[PDB]
């Protein structure tokens, strides 16, 4: 791209400097995704692996700040939609009532995808419905998660 007007440069620079703990001037490579997800771009893990293996020729993933800006102008046009993920939840509704089972949400969200851990899907259901238990809603839950 061109790229990247300054008001995103400052956020990429403070998030770029936040996850630097050795005093290098670059992030560590295990935390490479959470850099991008703390700012709200959210790439997938395998596409992150391809994108980091494009610029690396050593098998470590060590980049700098302009390469990270290049990766941000690549993914900047990939901002997801609201109705798309909401209809993706409506795929997992099997009863057509607007209700969704919490335990089957655990089964899907711990057996499919990037495989969320126990605290993340348990915290997911506890944020979905504070009263409980075992059966949750999603239609306001999608409004809660899709805010940057």
């Amino acid at each position: 791209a061109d790229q990247l007007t300054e008001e995103q440069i400052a956020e990429f620079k403070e998030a770029f400097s936040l996850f630097d703990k050795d005093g290098d001037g670059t992030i560590t490579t295990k935390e490479l995704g959470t850099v991008m997800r703390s700012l709200g771009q959210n790439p997938t893990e395998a596409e992150l692996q391809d994108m980091i293996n494009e610029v690396d020729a050593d098998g470590n993933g060590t980049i700098d700040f302009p390469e990270f800006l290049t990766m941000m102008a690549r993914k900047m046009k990939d901002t997801d939609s609201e109705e798309e993920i909401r209809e993706a939840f409506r795929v997992f509704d099997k009863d057509g009532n607007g209700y969704i089972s919490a335990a089957e949400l655990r089964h899907v969200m711990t057996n499919l995808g990037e495989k969320l851990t126990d605290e993340e899907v348990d915290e997911m259901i506890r944020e979905a419905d504070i009263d409980g238990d075992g059966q949750v809603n999603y239609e306001e839950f999608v409004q809660m998660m899709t805010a940057k």
Binding site: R90, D93, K94, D95, G96
Partner: protein, 146 residues
């Protein structure tokens, strides 16, 4: 309309979908379903039941609510789904029904009568009457069996 018996299907759930069509594939279908404790398999609107010779937990009153008033297509094969069709064709349509059990003794005919009439004893609204006629029917069964 959002669920189907095709999801989570052990083997092939409906034999009209079985390919290729002979007895050799079908024995393997009932084999691989009976191994995974799936003893019901449809042909069109036909229930195939296999006797497991034990009490399976697919007859809970919890699953009566699950099997009730879904469509024939929307859920995994079970015998109640036949009775849940028949009763509604008796209830909402006011047409007389009959449920035919064909097989040999020791394959589960009397059990199928007990489970069909048990579902009708569940969802009719006056369960104690159907249990009262039912108890004298199952009581009169070994009398006729003599």
């Amino acid at each position: 309309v959002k669920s189907s018996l095709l999801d989570n299907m052990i083997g092939v759930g409906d034999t009209v979908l079985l390919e290729p069509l002979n007895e050799e594939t079908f024995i393997d279908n009932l084999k691989k379903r009976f191994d995974h404790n799936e003893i019901y398999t449809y042909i069109g609107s036909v229930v195939i039941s296999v006797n497991p010779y034990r009490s399976l937990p697919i007859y809970s009153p919890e699953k009566v609510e699950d099997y009730r008033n879904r469509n024939f297509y929307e859920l995994s094969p079970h015998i109640f789904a036949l009775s849940d069709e028949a009763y509604r064709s008796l209830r909402d349509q006011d047409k007389d029904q009959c449920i035919l059990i064909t097989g040999e003794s020791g394959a589960g005919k009397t059990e199928a009568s007990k489970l069909v009439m048990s579902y009708v004893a569940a969802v009719c609204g006056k369960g104690a009457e159907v249990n009262q006629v039912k108890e004298q029917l199952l009581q009169s069964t070994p009398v006729l069996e003599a």
